């Protein structure tokens, strides 16, 4: 049910961003810091999305891609739309029309070098690493930067979870 109002999550995210801008002077640091906290988000987001549904591990990339879009539509209540595959089908792009986190906030012009909603890229990273799966994700387009809608990249460079659940660890 989510039992919570979208604006309240947006206000908590704005509290984070403003507090980072204060505590640390530079956008690069606050961004890498939030990417770390999002990495640590993912280590619980992915296990939750598994507790809601034991999805298959991986036979192909787009299977993971629609798994994660399902998850994004779960907690953010917003249906994403996968697109832009590799010729090698390894990497795709992810589309959010309007993030409750990203939206209800615009950006003062001084912070152009800031990448705002990068908490989600961190989320994806940590989510894929607790699931022992090696991927690179960055928002190729972000709603705030003048892009139509937030666009990501999802570069699944290699594997860390094997076919038997013994795995390498």
């Amino acid at each position: 049910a989510k039992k919570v109002n979208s604006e309240f999550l947006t206000l908590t995210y704005g509290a984070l961003v403003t507090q980072m801008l204060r505590d640390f002077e530079n956008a690069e640091d606050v961004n890498k810091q939030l990417e770390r906290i999002g990495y640590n988000m993912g280590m619980r987001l992915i296990e939750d999305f598994l507790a809601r549904t034991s999805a298959p591990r991986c036979l192909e990339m787009r299977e993971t891609a629609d798994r994660i879009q399902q998850a994004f539509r779960i907690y953010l209540n917003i249906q994403p739309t996968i697109s832009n595959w590799s010729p090698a089908s390894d990497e795709f792009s992810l589309v959010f029309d309007s993030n409750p986190l990203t939206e209800f906030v615009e950006l003062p012009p001084d912070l152009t070098n800031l990448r705002y909603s990068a908490i989600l890229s961190g989320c994806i990273r940590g989510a894929l690493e607790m699931v022992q799966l090696e991927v690179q994700c960055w928002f190729v387009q972000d709603q705030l930067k003048g892009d139509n809608v937030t666009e990501l990249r999802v570069k699944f460079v290699r594997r860390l979870e094997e076919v038997i659940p013994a795995g390498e660890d």
Partner: protein
Amino acid sequence: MIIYGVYIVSKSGGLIFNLDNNVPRIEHEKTFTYPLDLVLDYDSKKVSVSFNRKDGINVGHVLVAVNGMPVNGVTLDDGRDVRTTLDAPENYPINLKFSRPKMTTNEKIFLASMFYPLFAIASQLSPEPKSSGIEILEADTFTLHCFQTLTGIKFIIISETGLNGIDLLLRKVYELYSDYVLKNPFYSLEMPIRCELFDNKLQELLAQVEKTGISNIDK
């Protein structure tokens, strides 16, 4: 349905959580006469019996208390040792307490430690190709069901042997896991989870399943 114990372990395989659901070990007392047919053997802090498991005193029943006076590892409370107490005749006829060693927590840690490889080495050189490991290990008077998180953590619990419909219960304990790791994702595998709030939520899952309802997924 009665659950003897509940457990979860980490990528390390270390025992992260070992709540026990109160399953006592059997006890026996009997007014012992001249040297006892129980074959008492000293083995390295254990004062046990090796043979003649009579009257419901199993072989593994470690001496627990002597004549009401407690007995500690090899000797007794008062300083007497089991040997000196025993082989002195005229003390007899006497009572001796006996029961099984509730493996002190540390020993349970060791047990989980040694078990982890069996999980990870459940004949990884299997017959069946590209196989998958252990999930269900039945035993004499308990049965082990594990739920791999399908990536990472292991979920093993100890239930009454003759039972089905427990893997969904494992899924629900997985849900409790998610609930708690929401607390602090920094509060990670490295430290063990001993946070009494989530823990009484688990004991309420226990409370529900002690009663009839394990259908009625209500936790």
